[PDB]
């Protein structure tokens, strides 16, 4: 009894030091595409512009699929058709931001709220800094901090998403489960832009802060993480 | 001024209920005033059906 049990429960114990090793290993080698793709995607865009330029000839890189949108103005003196979109983008509060999947429907939702937001096609280190530093998840409908990744796996393990790095394909590459990756992900509440805006009111294009800033949103994100 | 579903009510207090209200704090002392008759009458007519004819 005792020493038929003693063993029986120690097994379970070790059958775990299998398992929580095995997974730990899995994550680590997943993280290893997540280098290799993550590099190969860079070079293979340069690769090709380099290829084009050799002929008398010419890229147009893939249109961006991902554009995290920062709301930049507050919440009073706000039209309706706007305020509804801004709470479909979950940008309720002033000057938080979400990872939005560009898309004829979504792009054209941003036209209509343009004067209040600031979006751009963000870059890896942007996604990283954000998911890492300011990425809490929605678990039982709660802003809960992503400290161990038994919290990600716990919501998203049914999409082959098991760790903080597996989230981060599904957040460039869009992937199949952009939707559900970017909806345990709870809108990222970003501090005031350190060193300050240019002009909250106007299009970037005319010196302001609003709507599209291609690429240049990554200056903006450094200042607000 | 009615508001949203009741009855009509013709309570009849337009006259002067106030003056002519009888309250009944006799009721129990009356009960007893009575008792003493039922009682007395019987002891007076000794052998005779107390209730009456």
């Amino acid at each position: 009894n005792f020493a038929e049990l003693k063993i029986k429960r120690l097994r379970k114990k070790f059958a775990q030091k299998m398992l929580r090793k095995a997974r730990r290993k899995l994550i680590y080698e997943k993280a290893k595409h997540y280098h290799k793709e993550y590099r190969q995607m860079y070079r293979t865009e340069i690769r090709m512009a380099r290829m084009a330029r050799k002929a008398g000839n010419f890229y147009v890189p893939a249109e961006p699929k991902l554009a995290f949108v920062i709301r930049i103005r507050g919440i009073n003196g706000v039209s309706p058709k706007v305020r509804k979109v801004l709470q479909l983008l979950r940008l309720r509060q002033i000057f938080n931001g979400t990872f939005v999947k560009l898309n004829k429907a979504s792009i054209n939702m941003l036209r209509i709220v343009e004067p209040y937001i600031a979006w751009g096609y963000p870059n890896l280190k942007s996604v990283n800094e954000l998911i890492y530093k300011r990425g809490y998840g929605k678990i039982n409908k709660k802003r809960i901090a992503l400290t161990d990744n038994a919290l990600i796996a716990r919501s998203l393990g049914k999409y082959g998403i098991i760790c903080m790095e597996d989230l981060i394909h599904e957040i460039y590459t869009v992937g199949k489960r952009f939707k559900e990756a970017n909806n345990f992900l709870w809108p990222f509440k970003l501090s005031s832009p350190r060193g300050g805006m240019k002009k909250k009111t106007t299009h970037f294009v005319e010196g302001g802060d609003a709507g599209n800033r291609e690429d240049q949103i990554n200056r903006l994100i450094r200042r607000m993480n | 001024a009615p508001s949203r579903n009741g009855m009509i009510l013709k309570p009849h207090f337009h006259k002067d209920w106030q003056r002519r209200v009888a309250t009944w704090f006799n009721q129990p002392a009356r009960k007893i005033r009575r008792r003493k008759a039922r009682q007395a009458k019987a002891r007076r007519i000794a052998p005779r059906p107390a209730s009456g004819p």
């Binding site: - | 001024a1 009615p2 508001s3 949203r4 579903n5 009509i8 009510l9 013709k10 309570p11």
Partner: protein, 147 residues
């Protein structure tokens, strides 16, 4: 009691659950059921339809004793009489059928609602329904009149 009222919670509370724009003035509408045609109309017409007007025919001096006539449904005769008078019979083998004076239990009329148990009966009553007739007949047993 006084203690458990809103008026306690309305002190320091100036207008007193009653509005300081339009105050609590004495009798804005009128007094009681007043303005039924005019201007309180929308209640009376939408909430008490058929108030304003005559109808029908007078019966003047009227006395209910003249037209006293309670009702019972077949549904529950097999109550009126002590349930043992049913358990006796349903059995017994002679076709007894107990008698039920719907009179004696207090009803000037018997009516055909409900099932009736398959059980022959003699119902003595006053003003029988048709259906009450048919059901009792169709079960077995009879319908005797009383004055």
């Amino acid at each position: 009691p006084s203690r458990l009222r809103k008026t306690r919670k309305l002190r320091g509370h100036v207008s007193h659950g009653h509005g300081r724009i339009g105050k609590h003035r004495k009798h804005p509408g009128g007094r009681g059921n007043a303005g039924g045609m005019h201007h309180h109309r929308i209640n009376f017409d939408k909430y008490h339809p058929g108030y304003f007007g005559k109808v029908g025919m007078r019966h003047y001096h009227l006395k209910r004793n003249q037209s006293f006539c309670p009702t019972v449904n077949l549904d529950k005769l097999w109550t009126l009489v002590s349930e043992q008078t049913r358990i006796n019979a349903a059995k017994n083998k002679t076709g007894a059928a107990p008698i039920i004076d719907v009179v004696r239990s207090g009803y000037y009329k018997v009516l055909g609602k409900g099932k009736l148990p398959k059980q022959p009966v003699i119902v003595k009553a006053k003003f029988f329904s048709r259906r009450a007739e048919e059901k009792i007949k169709g079960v077995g047993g009879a319908c005797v009149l009383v004055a």
